[PDB]
Each structure stands twice: as C-alpha cells, then as structure tokens.
Design an enzyme around this catalytic site. Structure first.
Site, PDB file in Angstrom:
ATOM      1  N   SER A 111     -58.298  48.158 -13.538  1.00  0.00           N
ATOM      2  CA  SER A 111     -57.765  48.489 -12.216  1.00  0.00           C
ATOM      3  C   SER A 111     -58.660  47.971 -11.095  1.00  0.00           C
ATOM      4  O   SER A 111     -58.790  46.756 -10.908  1.00  0.00           O
ATOM      5  CB  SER A 111     -57.567  50.002 -12.076  1.00  0.00           C
ATOM      6  OG  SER A 111     -56.756  50.302 -10.953  1.00  0.00           O
ATOM      7  N   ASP A 123     -46.904  46.201 -13.450  1.00  0.00           N
ATOM      8  CA  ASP A 123     -47.969  47.184 -13.290  1.00  0.00           C
ATOM      9  C   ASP A 123     -47.528  48.323 -12.375  1.00  0.00           C
ATOM     10  O   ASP A 123     -46.980  48.091 -11.291  1.00  0.00           O
ATOM     11  CB  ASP A 123     -49.221  46.509 -12.730  1.00  0.00           C
ATOM     12  CG  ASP A 123     -50.447  47.385 -12.836  1.00  0.00           C
ATOM     13  OD1 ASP A 123     -51.202  47.258 -13.822  1.00  0.00           O
ATOM     14  OD2 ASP A 123     -50.650  48.213 -11.926  1.00  0.00           O
ATOM     15  N   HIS A 182     -50.064  50.904 -17.016  1.00  0.00           N
ATOM     16  CA  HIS A 182     -51.256  50.646 -16.218  1.00  0.00           C
ATOM     17  C   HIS A 182     -52.489  50.880 -17.079  1.00  0.00           C
ATOM     18  O   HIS A 182     -52.612  51.940 -17.703  1.00  0.00           O
ATOM     19  CB  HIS A 182     -51.295  51.539 -14.970  1.00  0.00           C
ATOM     20  CG  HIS A 182     -52.301  51.100 -13.949  1.00  0.00           C
ATOM     21  ND1 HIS A 182     -52.504  49.776 -13.627  1.00  0.00           N
ATOM     22  CD2 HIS A 182     -53.164  51.810 -13.186  1.00  0.00           C
ATOM     23  CE1 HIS A 182     -53.447  49.689 -12.706  1.00  0.00           C
ATOM     24  NE2 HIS A 182     -53.865  50.910 -12.421  1.00  0.00           N
TER      25      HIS A 182
END
Ligand SMILES: *[C@@H]1O[C@H](CO)[C@@H](O)[C@H](O)[C@H]1NC(C)=O
Ligand SMILES: CC(=O)Nc1cccc2nonc12
Length: 353
Positions: A145, A253, A299
């Site tokens: 991330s 995503d 994710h």
C-alpha cells in the site's frame, strides 16, 4: 518472531517525537535481506493528523509497540508459507511517519509533528550494516500500500547510500505491492474542501509541503518545482529508476476504487468505469517486464498468510519472484510478466475470497 530494535539515533523519530525502529529476525547462514515497509494511508494537515493521533496512534508513535512480531507471508521463515525467501534475514519497519515514507522534517516549534519517513529508511539501513548487512549480496526493499509507493520513492536512495558508504557489491532491488495508483477521473466528483472530498492528486500536493517530502532525484528534474506530486504515481516515477523493481498490483484495487468514490446491482455507467479502470491499469504495466497483476477486487497480499494461493495463467506469486531471481543472474517455463487479460473482478478463479 522478529525482535524490536529502537533506533540508536534518537533524533530520527515517529510523528510524536518518539524514536522509530525496526523488527529483525537474523539468519547467519544467509546473505539475503528483506526490508518490508508497512502501509496505512497518510495525513496531510494539522487537523486530520490530530484525528489520526486519537484512533491510529500506533501509526504515529512507538510508545505502545509490541515486543516481538511474527513474520507472515513473504516475511515468514517457514518454507510451507514462504516458498520464496524463507531462509533470508527478515526486517519489518513499522510505518509511523504518515508521509508515504517521503518526509524529512523534524518536530520543532514550527511543526507539531515530525515527518521523517525518508530518513527512517536511511537510519535503519545504516544501523543494520553493523549487524550483518555489510556481508549481504541482495537487499530487497518491499512494501504494501503506502509502503509499496514508498519502495518506488526510496529504492534508488538505498542503492546510492550504500554506494557512498563503500558497499558497491550489494544489489538493491524493489518489490512494490499495491502501490501502483492512477490519477484518473473519478466516478463521482467532489472538490477538495475537507479530508473526504480531497482527491489524492491534491492531498499529496499539500502533503509534500506539509511533510517537506522528497522524491527520486531523476524524477524531480523532469516535473520540477511545484509538480513533485507526479512522482508519487507508479507509471510516472518507474521509468526514471535504475534499481530493478517487481510490481504487484490488483487490477481493481480497493484503495483505488475508494479514492475514485466507488462503493459496491451494478448498472451500465458504473460497469464501463470499472472495465475502463482495469484496461487502463494493464496499459501502464505493459512495459514493466517484472509484474504480477491479477484481475481481482482486493487490497494487499505479500504478507497475508495465504499469499501463495493466487495464480495468473498458472503461475503463483512466489514462483514469479523466484523466476525474477534467476533472471537477474527469457527463462523456459518460468515467466516474470504475469498480467491477466479478462475484464471484470474475479474473472480469475484464484482470486481471494
Ligand atoms: C542522526 O540522524 C540525523 C538525520 O539523519 C543526522 O543529522 C545525525 O548526524 C545523526 N546522528 C548520529 C549520531 O548518527
Ligand atoms: C495509501 C497510499 O499511499 N495511497 C496513495 C499513494 C500515492 C498515490 C495515490 N493515489 O491514490 N492513493 C494513493
């Protein structure tokens, strides 16, 4: 487990002035080092950084950090869970700077918080040299991330730093997971009046001047002053990098859809947007020779327990990373570029459930 180590240089701190650190499992019998960068969004002004300090303090302070941690996924030391690098030296660097690992500003009397994400990475590398890193052959810098974006922002910095310190034989590489964003048109538009209505293109611009954030030098000279926010986006900063980078990115995503104001009975207008987002992301990875992009709505991956389960055209992620390893010595039956082609979330049957 990985043992906690607070930074000996206490001037390099988390947001609230507390010292930063890293967790380490050490492996005498290996010359491979994995340095993982945690993620967890960011904060870009006084008032949403104050809200972050109330309910996400572990991402801004080290005073409450636990005493060991357990490596999972790529950070695991069991070959069953980590077929890739189970025998390597493991390092977990907690994310406590809220600057997408880009800041270089201390707490003073002008700054309520310190943003030293870029300097946290230097200091960990420098202090790890005296614990074995000086004899390493590969230093893989990974992250998820916001840590994935921080890999792209810092991978050349780690290489250059080890060149000036007298360690030219260490090969620095990057693994960016879920940090490959697009500054695209949104599904519904809202102009930046507060935190929820401020698109990342504009929050990051405020963040840089608030964090005193830095970007890869060779990307900075392209977009120049005032436009450093462009280097926070994968397809724009990647072409300027020298270190080998492996990119992992879900085609759909969830963080990308969140900032696009999409919250999943899908009708036509939304169907086209989702389909256009998937094709646009594949276009950016077309010239990325080492990539892995399944067509799933999820994710993060590389540190979850079941990160071996997803496959793209018959090849799992740890195998592709192993194929990557061999290519840095086209391999028969051992591919490195794996991008799905079907155009809707979960058209790949191996997607996470
Ligand atoms: C601690 O880190 C800061 C920032 O990188 C640097 O200016 C300072 O010289 C360092 N101190 C020591 C003792 O390494
Ligand atoms: C969590 C995080 O780091 N998000 C992001 C970083 C860089 C650019 C982005 N665009 O949308 N989100 C972005």
């Amino acid at each position: 487990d990985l043992r906690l180590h607070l930074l000996l240089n206490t001037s390099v701190t988390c947001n609230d002035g507390s010292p930063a650190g890293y967790y380490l499992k050490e492996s005498r019998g290996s010359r491979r080092w994995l340095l993982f960068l945690e993620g967890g969004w960011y904060c870009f002004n006084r008032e949403n950084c104050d809200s972050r300090y109330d309910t996400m303090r572990r991402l801004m302070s080290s005073r409450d950090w636990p005493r060991t941690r357990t490596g999972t996924g790529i950070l695991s030391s069991q070959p069953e869970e980590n077929p890739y690098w189970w025998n390597a030296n493991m390092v977990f660097i907690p994310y406590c700077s809220s600057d997408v690992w880009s800041g270089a500003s201390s707490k003073s009397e002008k700054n309520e918080y310190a943003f030293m994400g870029a300097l946290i990475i230097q200091e960990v590398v420098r202090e790890l040299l005296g614990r074995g890193l000086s004899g390493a052959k590969v230093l893989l810098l990974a992250g998820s991330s916001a840590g994935g974006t921080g890999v792209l922002l810092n991978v050349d910095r780690v290489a250059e730093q080890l060149e000036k310190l007298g360690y030219p034989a260490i090969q620095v590489r990057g693994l960016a997971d879920s940090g490959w964003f697009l500054d695209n048109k949104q599904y519904r538009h809202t102009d930046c009046v507060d935190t929820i209505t401020c698109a990342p293109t504009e929050a990051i611009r405020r963040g840089i001047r608030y964090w005193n954030g830095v970007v890869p030098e060779r990307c900075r000279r392209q977009f120049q002053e005032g436009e450093e926010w462009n280097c926070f986006f994968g397809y724009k900063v990647y072409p300027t990098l020298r270190s080998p980078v492996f990119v992992v990115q879900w085609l759909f995503d969830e963080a990308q859809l969140t900032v696009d104001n999409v919250h999943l009975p899908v009708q036509e207008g939304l169907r086209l947007y989702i389909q256009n987002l998937g094709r646009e992301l594949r276009h950016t990875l077309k010239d990325v020779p080492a990539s892995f992009a399944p067509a799933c709505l999820s994710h993060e991956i590389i540190i979850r327990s079941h990160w071996t389960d997803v496959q793209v055209k018959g090849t799992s992620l740890p195998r592709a990373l192993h194929c990557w390893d061999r290519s840095l010595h086209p391999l028969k039956g051992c591919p490195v570029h794996l991008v799905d082609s079907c155009p809707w979330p979960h058209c790949n049957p191996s997607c996470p459930t």
